[model samples]
Target: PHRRFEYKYSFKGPHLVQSDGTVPFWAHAGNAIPSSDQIRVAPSLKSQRGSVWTKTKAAFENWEVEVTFRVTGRGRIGADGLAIWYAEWNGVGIFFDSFNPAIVIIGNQALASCQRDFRNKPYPVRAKITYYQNTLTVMINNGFTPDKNDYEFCAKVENMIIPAQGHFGISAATGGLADDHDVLSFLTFQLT
Candidate 1:
């Protein structure tokens, strides 16, 4: 017999808040402060400093998400970076940032597979993640070294299961001089 797959939810626009001060349905955690430099709308990528969450009607026991991002602006500082989380309404994990290494993963918890900066290496910071049952395997492109010429490394979580049906999104934070960032592009999302 052939198995059928169903489509659940998707978004491709800026989210707005409600009039009562309560957060919007799409935004689950963090601060929802609107940025003045939102991409596709304003001059620079600004507007809303928080995470996006969406509950899927169909639960996924095994899944993978891939995203590509870019950070710009010469003077930005603090915990400005990107995160991919799979958690309940308010329990998403954080993957830390490119500029800041002090930020730690909370809630569902996240493991940084690669901290290339430790050795002054310059490789495209990328992660390939797989989650099945209650285990997570994160494979990074290169080993942690400052040589800038290594390839392949990984991290793992053996006994943790993401919420059955929760939300997922990209998040970034900034400190010192507010800078511009972008999700540059995403290949596609697939679940099996």
Candidate 2:
């Protein structure tokens, strides 16, 4: 029971650039691979930051979003990780930080999470955000293990109003610490 947008990352087909393209995505710092299903939101390069956003905004009020992404680099340290973002009061970003850890930020007011080992780890990771009944919940799963839920609780907010309507997308940035940031999947679901 949800309205969904699962556009495959078939970017960079002769003309992935803006100007005039049929694709609904707006990519600035990244490109999608032809053989891969994910979007290379930001290639692992030194002193680079990239982002790609959606052209459409979510229509529903109470909704949940699931993002599958990863940030891995050759360097031992990585900075500027992939973020699941919503456009509100500018833009609210829930970053799965590689350099830092997880962070829930909506402008200057920010709630930061603890740091975890991200570098020299696995490739992709999964995360979820649900805004339902005046509460927002964030969950993360580095990679499925034997005795763990995939989308375990990462963060939560109670009695807060979500955006009336907001566009959905993923973005990544790299500082001196570079990493390959890619978005594997993005799913939106309307709450019951």
Q: What's the number of clashes in each of the models?
A: 13, 0
Maximum-lDDT candidate: 2
Worst 10 residues of 1 by lDDT: 35-44
Give the per-residue lDDT digits (tens) of candidate 2, residues 46-146: 66656666666755667777766667777666777777777745645676677755555443266545344434445456667777787777777766442
For candidate 1, write residues 85-188 as lDDT tens digits: 66654544646455544323445434444453311223234445556556666554432343323335455666765677666666665555344444422222
Task: Tell how far residue 62 is off in model 2, in angstroms.
Answer: 0.7
In lDDT terms, how accurate is model 1?
Answer: 0.45
Off by over 4 Å in 2: 1-36, 89-91, 105-108, 112-114, 118-120, 144-149
Candidate 2, clashing residue pairs? none
In terms of lDDT, model 2 sits at 0.62
Best by TM-score: 2
